[PDB]
Design a protein around this ligand. Structure first.
Ligand SMILES: Nc1ncnc2c1ncn2[C@@H]1O[C@H](COP(=O)(O)OP(=O)(O)OP(=O)(O)O)[C@@H](O)[C@H]1O
Ligand SMILES: [Mg+2]
Lengths: 50, 514, 334, 464, 464, 50
């Protein structure tokens, strides 16, 4: 039990670090795609091509 | 990874459309204590879902010529005079599907466990009619609760409403969690006609207690077939009122699809309090203990959903295990009386028994299951037939345990048999027993094979024997679970194993049992 | 396995929160883009035109007894006013308002006149002996009809007579030909009052003498040279018999009654800017088609909408406003 | 002429009608719920006239989905239930709608469920006895023809089997009929009773009227009256003796209390309706013998808190003429009909009504079976040998007396195959006079179990 | 923009605002009283929106002297209280006004008293025992570190003495921060606590918020939330371990009931407000600890009429991990701390957490005490001699166990004169294992009374 | 801060002033007594309750 719990905790810490790094990495391309996403959203809430 | 992320926001942007349609608007003319009165909405229907500007929701529960009294389902602090109220046009409905297994959901079906959204197969309104008399079937399939006391003396059959009634900290939630856990061996079978799906409606319970129940189910592996409809004490009275109905709807979707469901409610005493609060705030006339006139209708409408459907409707079932917290063990209070009348059986868990070491504290004799032997497998029925009479005689004779020197041989035999049967019905928490092991235990007790073991050791004996039979003579358990009866060919072998094991047992005082 | 899952669900929660942030940023950028675009008058007019095109494709508080009594009384006013002239209508309205003031002042007189009875002869006799010589003859028929029919409660009687006192003036505007002008005017006085909460509150005759309230109204509101006589008279009558109803809601309800008399129902319209009579025409025709009755449009111009119109009539609303669309897009995001 | 719903407050609906068309009290009005999921035709029962053309009504069906301003059409008569020989063999709800054959009975004659009891001049002045043919009932707790009998019991004591027994006996001895008023009936138990009666082939002689618990309080309050109207039709029109079961009457009282609370009436006593006695009398006093035919009634009564002074039982028992208490002790000992001979009581068991010999025999039996109960403690603790010769005689005689009160009940014909036994009252009196005197104490105890009479007892003796 | 007082009724004040400026619920409004000695600035908290642009508010200070028509200004934000490390070592009232140093915190960060509880995703059960040094608490109802503890009791059974003792036992050597919420408690006890903490130098790590009973209902409602807001700031914004002492949490609901009827709500159960459970949940769920950041709350709950079935204690019981129940029956005997060993319970008392020897000893003690509570009546009427030998010896053990569960607590040297004592958990569980096995059956009962441990037990036995 | 619960049963029994020793309590306790009476009567109430 204790090894299972220790292994789970270690992998949880490692996964937290790795996934946090991966998320902020991908947020970079997120801020690129945001421009097009917002343009198309505007062209929807307006009902005509922006 | 990045492909998925924006994938979704982009998809929103696209599928998103400029909805523009007639809508009926009211205005909040009065708000307070979880109730908001809405002028307007002429087409509103009773128990309709209204949405207020801040994403808040409420239920149009009173309709007068002047205003609509709506109970606000949380986030009440964001309601103001003059805010627009927009009617959804649909009565309360909750999503339902197989995706709710392993999830914790608020009474509206929105997940609160922090995991992803739930793939809702369909929506069911919280007020659909219960199965009719013609759509039902006789309760005849056991629902093994794993508690020797319940399964032997107050059996629950699939489709029954077995109330668990007791004072605080007496073993109610423990009994229900043991019942939920005991269904894992049936779940792993993969046969829908044996699987029992569980819904644990938590009402007015502190968040950490629901988390503890979730951990208890998860460590025992029962979360993969259990859904928690959590309405913690922090939520408005509306959620504590609707949680039983959201659990009933989730269970009913499976019930009508042919699955078998077990619906637990800790506690209907807290749902009734929530409804009382809502009614008094809405100024509905109060009756006994300030409850509104239709509290019995509340609980009956909730519990009459539980039923076993005829084979024409798929043959599914929904078994209720309402939990009600009496005060000072006064089963005559209003809500306890109502539920005792509604339910098909009662398990009276008393604190005096709990302190005396009887756990799970079920007061045999007063606790009954009107379904009776029809909810037991043949083996359990045959073994436990004598159990109730023996325990009644023991409770009659217990005053004589002091002066047994002067008792008749038969009377002393009954006293000693009962003193060991009561130990036999004890059971540690989170340790449910499969039906075959219960059969073997009550067989030890009733046939008298425990009459030689000291009362102090029965619990250990029964354990060390069952384990032994599980390890070296698993044939008995296989026969019992496959045939549902304890035949003579297997009974003789079981007695032989009992006598073989009794030689190897060392009672706690050092004596020898043979 | 539990730990595995927990890390997989942590990855999915990372995905969900990153998507939430992306959606929030996209919503902010789209809102900025649309607000910048709509800033141009041509774009705003185009949004209003599309809104109109999309739309193209699309006494109640009285209880039963008072409802029937007021219905019968209005029936009467119809016949009685069918003969009187403009001066006759003015005299009828003034006398009805005066008797309404008398009823309001003497609470005991109200009760016993409003109290229902199978035979109304005692009430009719009381009304005759107390007002027959004082007021014009035509007022007597209306007041007898009012005190003859059974009212749900005492207060309703006042609401009856005052109502008739209003109708007279409206009928005057109907015969003089300013029915639309008086309604428009009332609406203008409405917002005026809505623009001065202190003025509306101080106009509560329920707290101060009615004559003082009317003098305040004259010095403040009806003294403007361009005010129509009918609208000023209606507002003075209403404020002098306000009886606790907020002066604002009173005058808006008066405008509602003015339009209802003509059989049309007024739709309150809010927009970022007025939109030409072209608009009015097309929008009025569209709303009339949707609601199957002639409709009047009142423009509550406000830049908050940031684009298309938001319309409300009765309990129903058409909401294609750009602000509402931004709110919908923001809420619908994951 | 049709009204409009102005208020919805739970099961209470206020309807505003035109000035001259307000419905009279207890009229059944129909309203439409048109929401797709909950489409329904609400049947509202006018409870009060609030004035200004408003009538307050108790919805007999859930109001979830009702809309203000929805048209309400007045039927012009109280809730009407179907009546006739055609209502036998079918299950109805409180409103007269068939549940096992929807649309059934809508062409039958319909009777208002509100009707005054028989005129005072038409009431029978003498309390005749209903000789059912059961030894225990006829001897110790004689049922009153046209009276109300409490039926205490529970699960596993053969209450349903006894109900079948009485249905069979009223059908085949008195040529009558039974009407089962399931007030507050658990849907599971309702279906179980339906299938049990169908299997026993007694449904054809029984009209079932279930007001289920899940239904609002109104139907639970009116189901007893609906079943009672069916029984009254069978009595007055068809001239049949009727046996009307009510399970449970306390739930009729509870539904009345809930309706009273909903309509804003101040509760009395322990929270019960102020009109408790009037409602209970209007229900019970219609259960009477008139013009020669009689509606006997067996009523399962629940005593809250085990308090016979609680107003619900305290008012019910003013109308009950007998009490039959099924016990799990007697049941476990193989005695069917499972009637506890000592807890059960009957108010017609006096020599003025029953014969003097009957009273003497019954009192002797009660004396014996009470001694035996007192000596049961000695037997179970110190053994039978601890008793004296006289006591042991008495115990051996009481065993046979209590086992002879058992009977091969008619309802057992479906299980044991052997026909049921109807012992005439005289034969029962003579048999128990012989049995208390010890004239049959030499026979084995097994000779008395489930034996229908005295000659049958010989033949189970010579067979042993 | 400012409002106007329209109606004053005790602690409830109605304010009419202009149509466009009706304050939001729970916003703080300011009014002014100008009369001499009662002159002040009156804080009101909007409770309801009555319509017609009116709001109904609860007054934090007494409304005596307030005048109809007085100007009311809206603050635009709910009542806010100071937060930060600076609140430690100082005394505050409900509104956040420092008492010992007026105007101290008017520049600190201010947090709204009203906030939602932590999301369910963040809540994790706590199962770490907290060793207190008291025999009864550490044995029968062990306390949970980071969980919720309560000290139930009737009027004057020692809740305040025990809560002060627990402050002395946990907080005195606590590494983190402590917050004490004197919710409607006696002011003398609060001042004694303040001086005691100052003398022991614990005050520097404690923040005190007093809403004592001399203050009107609204401030009694909101003092608990203010102290809890400080505790939440310490939990979330600093990740520190926090002790949240409260006395008495019942006063929150009692104040709610006091203003319930004025505010327009119909009353529920025994005079309580309908929203009792809702308010208690909204306050209690905020006290929960979340994963990685702990609050060890231990809140005294007052039981009205010494009736544990009263709605307020009954509702409070659900929000608690450990429940030490004081009873006047035990207090009347002299068994200080007056803990009822039986009714008192704890969630952490399981074999998986506290051990398997601790659990056995505690459960055997409970068994013995329950048996001696069922034998007490027989002893009082029949006599101890009439009992069995086993029951007699068990009664001796039970009396000794009851007296040994008593302890001379450190903060109750004004009660008994002698100094306090701490019994380590292991020593307690061995002491009670010995007692339940009869190792001390020969010592006199008085040897176990108010004696802290085995060594002191031997000393007192030798003294006697 | 305390209670001196006078009981009729004790009063009739001849215990006057009739203080029920058990229920009665003074939370100021020894702090409200001169040192001498604190020393002599330190445990008197609990002794009498026992
Ligand atoms: N069979 C059992 N054996 C031993 N301990 C048990 C058993 N059942 C319950 N307990 C313990 O009893 C205490 C109360 O149990 P449980 O959580 O079921 O309470 P409950 O009666 O549902 O009350 P509530 O939810 O009101 O606190 C807990 O310590 C639980 O561990
Ligand atoms: Mg529980």
């Amino acid at each position: 039990r204790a090894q299972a719990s220790g292994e789970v905790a270690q992998t949880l810490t490692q996964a937290d670090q790795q996934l946090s790094a991966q998320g902020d990495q991908v947020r970079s391309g997120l801020e690129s795609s945001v421009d097009g996403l917002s343009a198309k959203l505007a062209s929807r809430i307006l009902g005509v091509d922006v | 990874s990045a492909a998925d992320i924006e994938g979704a926001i982009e998809d929103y942007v696209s599928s998103f459309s400029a909805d523009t349609e007639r809508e009926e608007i009211g205005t909040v003319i009065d708000a307070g204590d979880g109730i908001a009165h809405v002028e307007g909405l002429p087409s509103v229907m009773t128990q309709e879902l209204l949405e207020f500007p801040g994403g808040v929701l409420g239920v149009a529960l009173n309709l007068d010529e002047h205003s609509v009294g709506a109970v606000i389902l949380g986030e009440f602090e964001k309601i103001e005079e003059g805010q627009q109220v927009k009617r959804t046009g649909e009565v309360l409905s909750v999503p339902v599907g197989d995706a709710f297994l392993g999830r914790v959901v608020n009474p509206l079906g929105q997940p609160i466990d922090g995991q992803g959204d739930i793939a809702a197969e369909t929506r069911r309104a919280l007020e659909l009619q219960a199965p009719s008399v013609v759509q039902r079937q006789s309760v005849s399939e056991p629902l093994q609760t794993g508690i020797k006391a319940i399964d032997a003396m107050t059996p629950i059959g699939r489709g029954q409403r077995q109330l668990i009634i007791g004072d605080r900290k007496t073993g109610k939630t423990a009994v229900c969690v043991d019942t939920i856990l005991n269904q894992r061996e049936a779940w792993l079978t993969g046969d829908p006609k044996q699987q029992v799906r569980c819904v644990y409606v938590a009402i007015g319970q502190k968040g950490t207690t629901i988390a503890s129940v979730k951990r208890a189910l998860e460590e025992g592996g029962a979360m993969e077939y259990t859904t928690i409809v959590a309405a913690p004490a922090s939520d408005a009275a509306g959620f504590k009122w609707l949680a039983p109905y959201t659990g009933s709807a989730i269970g009913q979707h499976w019930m009508y699809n042919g699955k078998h469901v077990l619906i637990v409610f800790d506690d209907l005493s807290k749902q009734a309090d929530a409804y009382r609060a809502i009614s008094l705030l809405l100024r509905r006339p109060p009756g006994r203990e300030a409850f509104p006139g239709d509290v019995f209708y509340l609980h009956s409408r909730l519990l009459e959903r539980c039923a076993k459907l005829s084979d024409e409707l798929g043959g599914g079932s929904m078994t209720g295990l309402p939990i009600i917290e009496t005060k000072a063990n006064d089963i005559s209070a209003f809500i306890p009386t109502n539920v005792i009348s509604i339910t098909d059986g009662q398990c009276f868990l008393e604190s005096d028994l709990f302190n005396q070491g009887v756990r799970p504290a079920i007061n045999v004799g007063v606790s009954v299951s009107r379904v009776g032997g029809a909810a037991q497998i043949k083996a359990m029925k045959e073994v436990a037939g004598s159990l109730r009479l023996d325990l009644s005689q023991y409770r009659e004779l217990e005053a004589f345990a002091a002066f047994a020197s002067d008792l008749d041989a038969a009377s002393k035999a009954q006293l000693d048999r009962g003193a060991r049967l009561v130990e036999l019905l004890k059971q540690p928490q989170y340790s449910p027993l499969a039906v075959e092991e219960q059969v073997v235990a009550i067989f030890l007790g009733t046939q008298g094979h425990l009459d030689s073991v000291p009362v102090e050791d029965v619990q250990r004996f029964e354990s060390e024997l069952l384990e032994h039979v599980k390890a070296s003579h698993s044939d008995i358990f296989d026969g019992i679970r496959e045939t549902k009866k304890l035949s003579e060919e297997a009974e003789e072998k079981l007695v032989s194993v009992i006598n073989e094991f009794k030689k190897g047992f060392q009672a706690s005082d050092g004596s020898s049992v043979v | 396995a539990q730990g595995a899952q927990q890390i997989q669900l942590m990855r999915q929660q990372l995905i969900r929160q990153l998507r939430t942030g992306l959606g929030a940023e996209a919503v902010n950028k789209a809102a900025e883009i649309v607000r910048a675009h709509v800033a141009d008058p041509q774009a705003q007019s185009a949004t209003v035109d599309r809104f109109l095109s999309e739309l193209e494709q699309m006494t109640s508080r009285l209880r039963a007894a008072s409802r029937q009594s007021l219905a019968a009384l209005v029936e009467k006013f119809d016949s009685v006013a069918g003969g009187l002239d403009a001066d006759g209508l003015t005299n009828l309205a003034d006398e009805l308002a005066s008797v309404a003031k008398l009823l309001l002042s003497e609470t005991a007189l109200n009760k016993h006149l409003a109290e229902p009875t199978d035979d109304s002869a005692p009430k009719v006799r009381l009304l005759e002996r107390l007002l027959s010589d004082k007021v014009s003859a035509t007022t007597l028929d209306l007041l007898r009809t009012a005190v003859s029919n059974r009212w749900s409660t005492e207060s309703n009687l006042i609401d009856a007579v005052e109502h008739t006192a209003r109708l007279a003036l409206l009928k005057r505007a109907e015969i003089a030909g300013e029915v639309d002008e008086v309604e428009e005017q009332l609406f203008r006085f409405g917002r005026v009052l809505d623009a001065e909460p202190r003025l509306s509150a101080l106009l509560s005759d329920y707290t101060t003498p009615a004559e003082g309230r009317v003098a305040l109204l004259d010095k403040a509101l009806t003294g403007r040279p361009g005010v129509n006589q009918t609208a000023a008279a209606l507002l003075s009558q209403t404020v002098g018999l306000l009886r606790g109803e907020r002066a604002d809601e009173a005058v808006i309800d008066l405008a509602e009654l003015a339009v209802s008399r003509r059989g049309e129902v007024v739709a309150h319209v809010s927009a970022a800017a007025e939109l030409s009579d072209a608009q009015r025409t097309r929008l009025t025709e569209v709303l009339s088609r949707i609601y199957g009755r002639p409709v009047s449009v009142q423009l509550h111009v406000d830049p908050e909408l940031l684009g298309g119109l938001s319309i409300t009539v009765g309990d129903e609303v058409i909401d294609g406003s750009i602000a509402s669309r931004l709110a919908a897009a923001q809420t619908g995001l994951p | 002429t049709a009204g409009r719903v102005v208020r919805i407050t739970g099961p209470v609906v206020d309807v505003e009608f035109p000035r001259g068309s307000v419905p009279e009290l207890f009229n059944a009005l129909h309203a439409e719920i048109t929401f797709g999921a909950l489409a329904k035709t609400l049947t509202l029962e006018v409870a009060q006239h609030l004035g200004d053309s408003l009538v307050r009504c108790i919805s007999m069906q859930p109001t979830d989905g009702l809309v203000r301003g929805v048209e309400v059409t007045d039927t012009g008569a109280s809730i009407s239930v179907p009546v006739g020989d055609g209502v036998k063999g079918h299950v109805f709800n409180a409103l007269g709608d068939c549940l096992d054959d929807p649309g059934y009975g809508k062409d039958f004659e319909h009777w208002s469920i509100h009707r005054k009891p028989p005129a005072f001049s038409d009431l029978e002045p003498r309390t005749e006895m209903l000789e059912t043919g059961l030894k225990v009932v006829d001897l110790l707790t004689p049922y009153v023809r046209g009276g109300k009998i409490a039926l205490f019991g529970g699960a596993g004591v053969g209450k349903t089997v006894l109900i079948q027994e009485m249905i069979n006996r009223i059908a085949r001895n008195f040529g009558g009929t039974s009407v089962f008023a399931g007030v507050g009936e658990r849907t599971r138990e309702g279906n179980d009773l339906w299938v049990e009666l169908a299997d026993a082939n007694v449904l054809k002689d029984t009209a079932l009227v279930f007001g289920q618990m899940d239904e609002p309080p109104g139907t639970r309050m009116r189901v007893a009256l609906s079943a009672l109207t069916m029984a009254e039709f069978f009595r007055d029109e068809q001239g049949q003796d009727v046996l009307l079961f009510i399970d449970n009457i306390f739930r009729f009282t509870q539904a009345g209390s809930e309706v009273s609370t909903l309509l804003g009436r101040m509760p009395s006593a322990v929270g019960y309706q102020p009109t408790l006695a009037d409602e209970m009398g209007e229900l019970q006093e219609r259960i009477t013998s008139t013009r020669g035919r009689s509606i006997t009634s067996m009523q399962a009564v629940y005593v809250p808190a085990d308090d016979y002074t609680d107003p619900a039982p305290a008012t019910t028992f003013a109308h009950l003429d007998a009490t039959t208490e099924l016990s799990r002790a007697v049941f476990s000992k193989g005695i069917f009909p499972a009637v506890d001979p000592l807890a059960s009581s009957s108010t017609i068991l006096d020599p003025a009504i029953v014969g003097d010999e009957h009273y003497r025999v019954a009192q002797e039996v009660i004396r014996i079976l009470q001694r035996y109960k007192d000596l049961q403690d000695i037997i179970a603790i110190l053994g039978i040998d601890e008793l004296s010769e006289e006591d042991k005689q008495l115990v051996n005689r009481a065993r046979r007396i209590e086992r002879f009160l058992s009977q091969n009940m008619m309802a057992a014909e479906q299980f044991t195959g052997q026909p049921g036994s109807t012992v005439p009252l005289k034969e029962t009196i003579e048999a128990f006079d012989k049995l208390t005197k010890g004239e049959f104490d030499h026979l084995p105890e097994q000779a008395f179990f489930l034996i229908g009479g005295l000659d049958d007892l010989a033949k189970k003796a010579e067979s042993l």
